[PDB]
């Protein structure tokens with residue numbers, strides 16, 4: 057497996073919920089980058105060096121993903137709720153001495169990120185979320201067209217071992233299908249093949265796949281419930297935040313992303329990037345430039 | 354190796370322009386077509402068909418592309434697996450038997466064929482029974498978080514090929530048993546005759562059969578929905594007397610009445626809950642049989 061972050065250190069950060077793996081590079085204010093599904097930290101390999109010129113970039117595998125330890129789940133999928141994940145990452149950052157840091161997340165990592173910002177906003181200087189709406193918003197907009205487009209939200213949330221048994225027949229196909237289907241081009245051409253290798257190898261582990269389903273089960277239940285409480289209480293993210301989304305991406309599929317985030321965040325700017333879901337790999341220059349400018353503010 | 358679950362029923366291969374329909378045929382009297390759904394075959398009727406055969410010529414057919422019926426080759430619009438096309442094929446199949454006016458009971462996908470038949474060609478039907486469904490349009494209009502999780506397979510199997518095909522191939526035995534078990538009231542396979550499960554398992558083991566089922570669900574997400582939508586917007590109602598049976602723990606029920614929903618679609622509909630999960634004729638065979646005999650006799 058290729059090192060896609062030449063010059064970046066490698067940290068195994070111990071937490072009470074297991075070790076967080078992270079590539080660490082650059083200097084300056086701490087910036088935590090969180091990948092999503094079905095990826096690992098290496099999806100930032102095209103934008104992290106650019107950020108590393110101005111920030112201490114911490115590129116972490118989510119709890120349960122990539123090389124991070126996999127906390128044993130439970131009946132409520134607790135360790136893979138975004139609330140628990142955010143707690144674990146806060147702990148991880150504290151092990152490095154970062155108690156106040158900037159955060160950019162994509163996909164599942166973006167969900168950890170806004171949940172972190174709701175639960176523990178004092179930990180965040182600024183927050184960027186890439187190609188998501190809040191989990192609550194996806195579910196609330198889950199009509200026919202949206203159920204078809206993000207079917208995996210209900211499929212991977214099915215009780216164990218139903219998704220796991222089906223994914224186990226041909227894990228390579230599924231990880232490649234999900235990568236391809238959500239690019240602007242609809243194929244794997246936006247990805248570095250050595251990165252695809254990282255994604256493929258992570259997905260080949262049956263426990264890693266279970267964890268991804270657990271993440272999606274949390275996404276269907278506890279994560280939804282946590283968000284529901286916040287939106288129905290009018291709890292807004294007080295951290296300055298950037299919402300970036302792909303013009304051909306998931307977030308814009310069933311809502312105007314900046315409109316939705318303005319319901320969730322008191323101080324949100326948004327920009328579309330010509331790209332599918334995988335902004336940091338499909339449109340690395342445009343994404344890194346948006347992130348550098350936002351976080352330099 | 355595959356048990357004959359319809360003692361006294363013959364077997365017909367009925368020729369249609371789109372391929373052969375397989376059916377078990379038993380009884381005498383008015384013709385009654387029974388249509389299974391997913392992921393079953395005609396054998397799901399094995400506990401109630403003998404009851405109905407006391408009073409009716411019971412024709413227990415595998416849907417087009419299901420079971421032992423031929424699989425017409427699909428196209429870009431999944432046309433042969435739309436309920437409209439399936440209904441046209443079964444209308445032709447019944448015509449081959451001299452049945453141009455018949456009673457009809459369908460469960461699951463077969464109930465979808467059945468009410469679409471009733472909408473398109475109401476004069477073909479004396480009476481209609483639908484087991485544990487709402488119209489396809491209604492499922493999609495009610496698509497929310499809760500329903501998306503419950504009938505996830507409606508969007509999963511409608512994914513463009515070969516995504517569900519490939520995943521279904523990962524563990525087809527588990528999948529069909531899981532679908533059967535998870536929609537019963539018990540949550541296991543104890544409601545089913547093990548010889549019936551063997552039929553469902555063996556049908557599900559053929560990748561071509563699984564592909565057809567996905568085509569059926571692709572139709573269910575697209576053409577089928579659009580056909581239903583037109584009838585909704587035109588105010589077209591099913592005019593044949595209709596019986597809607599649903600499991601108290603089935604798919605059709607939720608918070609609002611299945612019967613209140615069917616009244617929007619049919620002008621003459623009666624409805625009863627059955628203590629049952631989704632698979633009324635196997636989970637509650639005599640309560641289902643009694644409801645069907647009482648209704649179809651009139």
Ligand SMILES: [Ca+2]
Nearest residue numbers: 221523524527
């Ligand atoms: Ca297996």
